[PDB]
C-alpha cells in the first residue's frame, strides 16, 4: 500500500497532491495574481484587450 501511495502521489499525480492546487499553480505560472481558472481567464482577457 505504501508503494502504491508513492506511485499514485509522485508518479501519476506529479508533485501535486490534487488537481485544485495544480490549477492554482497553472494560474500562478501564466498570471501574476494567484487564483482560480476564472481568475486566469480574467487576467488573460485583460491582457488580450
Amino acid at each position: 500500500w505504501g508503494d502504491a501511495s508513492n506511485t499514485f502521489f509522485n508518479l501519476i499525480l506529479g508533485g501535486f497532491q490534487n488537481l485544485s492546487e495544480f490549477v492554482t499553480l497553472i494560474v500562478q505560472a501564466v498570471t501574476g495574481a494567484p487564483g482560480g481558472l476564472t481568475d486566469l481567464q480574467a487576467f488573460l482577457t485583460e491582457r488580450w484587450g
Binding site: 500500500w1 505504501g2 502504491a4 501511495s5 499514485f8 502521489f9 497532491q17
Partner: protein, 98 residues
C-alpha cells in the same frame, strides 16, 4: 457474522483502505483511519455468549462444575437467536429423573 462476515471483510475494508490511501495515510501516518484492520480481528468481536444459570447455582451450592461450551445443531444461528441458543445450551446439563 454480523461483525466479520467475508463480504464485510472484503468490501468494507477495501473501501476504507482506498479512502485512507486517497487521503494519503500510507504517504504519511498523519491521517486518522476508519476500520482498516477489520480482517485482523476475525472471530474476536462479540463472538461469544456466556450465561451463568443463577437458579442452577442456587440449587447446587458452593461446590459445583463451572461452565460448559455448547455447539448448536445449526452452527451459525446463535447470532440470529441468542436466547434460543442459550436455552438449547442449557438443555444439556440439568437435573434428571428417570
Amino acid at each position: 457474522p454480523a461483525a466479520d462476515a467475508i463480504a464485510k471483510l472484503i468490501i468494507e475494508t477495501t473501501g476504507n483502505l482506498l479512502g485512507y490511501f486517497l487521503l494519503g495515510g500510507f504517504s504519511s501516518a498523519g491521517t486518522i483511519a476508519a476500520d482498516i484492520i477489520m480482517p485482523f480481528l476475525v472471530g474476536t468481536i462479540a463472538a461469544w455468549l456466556q450465561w451463568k444459570n443463577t437458579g442452577r447455582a442456587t440449587e447446587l451450592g458452593w461446590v459445583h462444575y463451572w461452565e460448559l461450551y455448547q455447539q448448536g445443531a445449526e452452527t451459525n444461528s446463535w447470532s440470529l437467536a441468542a436466547l434460543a441458543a442459550l436455552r438449547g445450551g442449557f438443555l444439556v446439563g440439568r437435573s434428571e429423573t428417570v
